[PDB]
Symmetry: C2
Subunit: 284 residues, 2 copies
């Protein structure tokens, strides 16, 4: 059984659940936000073993029977309870995500990998370690360091640090003392790339920068780097962003471990949804 953790308003999951059922994989779809309302659970650890079940709308499913947990846009635990409470949300999150941890299921982004992966400064160091070109980048709170970085790269771009943009002209960088900020050399962009990774599968798309998404072959070296990266982050799904050069170089910007994917499969018709279902349907 594949277990899908998402909000009811999520419409990109529907496509994956349709492929799962066509393949004869049973599927349970619930919002962790419905805990103590639509959803229940039990877990007994005794005599060295663990037994445990989930229930949604009445249908029960062995927790040991989950072959896959796909996590995509779930609400915070029991946050749609009769009397929501950050305590209720914490006890519920722990009951659920703690009894799933060690279940034996495969996670479409294991929560702990996923936690580590939201840190963009980590993403960049990892991309370098993997061979992906990254644009020169400084994140700093010394105006002086900012000023000298702008000497080397006078044509810069300003982006946030966390996991949007702008251009700096001639400036003092004095306000960097008051908040850590990210300067990045600008890329002579000609396309946007959106690489969706599903396992070792890479489904990339291209929008022009001078319009709809269109299917993009992945240059062999980027493919190599993206698999090392996926593999090192221990991520089963990633939505990566690159900028494409006049030379055709793909410049890493961001890997989003839960980035949307519906908007590409619409335009390009690439089977991303079917590729996820395939991944999730493998039996642990």
């Amino acid at each position: 059984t594949v277990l899908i953790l998402t909000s009811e308003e999520d419409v990109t999951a529907d496509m994956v659940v349709v492929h799962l059922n066509a393949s004869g994989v049973p599927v349970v779809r619930l919002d962790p936000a419905d805990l103590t309302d639509s959803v229940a659970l039990s877990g007994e650890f005794a005599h060295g073993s663990f037994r445990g079940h989930l229930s949604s709308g009445g249908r029960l499913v062995s927790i040991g029977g989950l072959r896959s947990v796909w996590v995509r846009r779930p609400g915070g635990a029991a946050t749609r309870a009769a009397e929501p409470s950050a305590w209720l949300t914490e006890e519920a999150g722990q009951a659920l995500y703690g009894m799933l941890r060690g279940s034996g299921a495969r996670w479409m982004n294991q929560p702990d990998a996923a936690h580590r992966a939201r840190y963009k400064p980590w993403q960049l160091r990892l991309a370098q370690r993997c061979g992906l070109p990254v644009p020169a980048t400084l994140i700093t709170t010394f105006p002086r360091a900012a000023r000298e970085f702008a000497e080397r790269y006078p044509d810069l771009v300003v982006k946030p640090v966390s996991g949007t943009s702008r251009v700096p002209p001639e400036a003092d960088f004095s306000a960097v003392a008051h908040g850590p900020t990210l300067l990045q050399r600008r890329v002579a962009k000609r396309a946007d790339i959106r690489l969706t990774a599903v396992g070792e599968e890479l489904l990339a798309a291209r929008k022009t920068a001078l319009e709809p998404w269109r299917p993009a072959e992945v240059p062999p070296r980027v493919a190599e780097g993206v698999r090392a990266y996926l593999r090192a982050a221990g991520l089963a799904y990633g939505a990566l962003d690159f900028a494409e050069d006049g030379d055709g170089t793909w410049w890493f910007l961001e890997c989003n471990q839960s980035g949307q994917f519906g908007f590409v499969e619409v335009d390009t018709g690439q089977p991303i949804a079917r590729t996820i279902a395939e991944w999730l349907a493998r039996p642990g």
Copy 2:
């Protein structure tokens, strides 16, 4: 250089900065809440490598130069900034803890290990897997299951699920589990209480008897305890699986002498056990953090 990340207040940390200072191991302590004020940073990602630095007061160290990071009760980043902001402590949070990831430094609790380790239901599963004993435990929002569980085990306690206590009436209506996850545990005899502090693979355990009783003026202290060899195997295994350089595990002693696992708090205190037993937990930490990076 050793990097401690704590509040100015932290007592248990001071204990360790002295040992470090004694041994000439270059330390740098600071609260992340002092970012954009007393504390500031810069990192450059260029030409396939990273070069960055940290500055507290005038002190300045290379991030490549860090050999370890002790994470001991620090502040929300830039919370004690001149002009605090949720958005700003988010952007500082990433700037600091994101450049430290992959920096090259031995984390006293890696932050991602730590995140997984707070999940108390996981901690039970894992100690089970490591051979440590575990009292029968139900986690539930199922009145029926709670009521069958009490049937099987009528001497129960009721810990809270989360890992980031009370006893059960002998005839209780378990109906409000439907409104809140509940953890029911069979109670241990409990001759003693065990506090195992784990610093790398070194285990410093301590015992405190449990049960004239009443007008005693709180004068039953912690006393050094010897770790059953097979427990030390499971405990060292647990830390290895979880990724933890440091852990503060609580056991209940059986009277038969067995050591029932209750929880492993990765952020847990150890000061209160070293004042009583004089076991050198702080200096063991200091040595661990002083190792090369």
